[PDB]
């Protein structure tokens, strides 16, 4: 519901946005030529929202806040070196992605060694990403019999805060 700010000073254009904190979007304007005058805008989420991040069809980062009740909040394994997972159906039936972002206790995005997605039943590879605080699955045909497992392997700190949401383009 809370969107990044797309407006920029004259001579500048919106370029991308990232989750600066779990509760703060950060948007970036760019000038031509590039300069240090470029407007960077921080947008707070509402307290019931969490910032989620993914890459758009053009490769640019896009961040926005979604109500936590509208996605899956989960904890990564207590032992950072243990891969832990959660499973999610998405309504209605159809082709959707999942995205996942991981935060540490200070509400900072934290890179994890591996985020992997498995279509179920069958443990079908639906995407593997590494050394990243966020990562999205392939486009997967969800249905009453088809759902998706998301696995996080931190490789460092455990008990991290993960958020898994669904999206389409």
């Amino acid at each position: 519901d809370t969107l990044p700010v797309s407006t920029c000073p004259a001579g500048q254009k919106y370029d991308r946005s990232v989750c600066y904190k779990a509760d703060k979007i950060r948007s970036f304007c760019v000038a031509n030529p590039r300069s240090n005058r470029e407007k960077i805008t921080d947008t707070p989420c509402q307290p019931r929202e969490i910032c989620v991040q993914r890459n758009l069809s053009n490769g640019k980062s896009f961040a926005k806040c979604i109500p936590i009740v509208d996605l899956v909040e989960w904890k990564t394994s207590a032992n950072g070196n243990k891969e832990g997972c959660t499973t999610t159906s998405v309504n209605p039936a159809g082709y959707h992605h999942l995205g996942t972002i991981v935060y540490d206790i200070n509400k900072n995005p934290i890179e994890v060694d591996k985020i992997s997605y498995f279509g179920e039943p069958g443990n079908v590879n639906e995407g593997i990403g590494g050394s990243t605080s966020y990562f999205s699955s392939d486009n997967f045909q969800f249905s009453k019999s088809r759902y998706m497992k998301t696995c996080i392997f931190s490789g460092g700190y455990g008990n991290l805060n993960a958020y898994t949401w669904s999206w389409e383009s």
């Binding site: 758009l56 499973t87 669904s166």
Partner: peptide, 18 residues
């Protein structure tokens, strides 16, 4: 069966994803 069911599907506004 899955542990969770999602009932909200995010789509980026056109002004960001043309």
């Amino acid at each position: 069966v899955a542990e969770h069911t999602i009932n909200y599907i995010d789509i980026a506004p056109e002004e960001f994803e043309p």
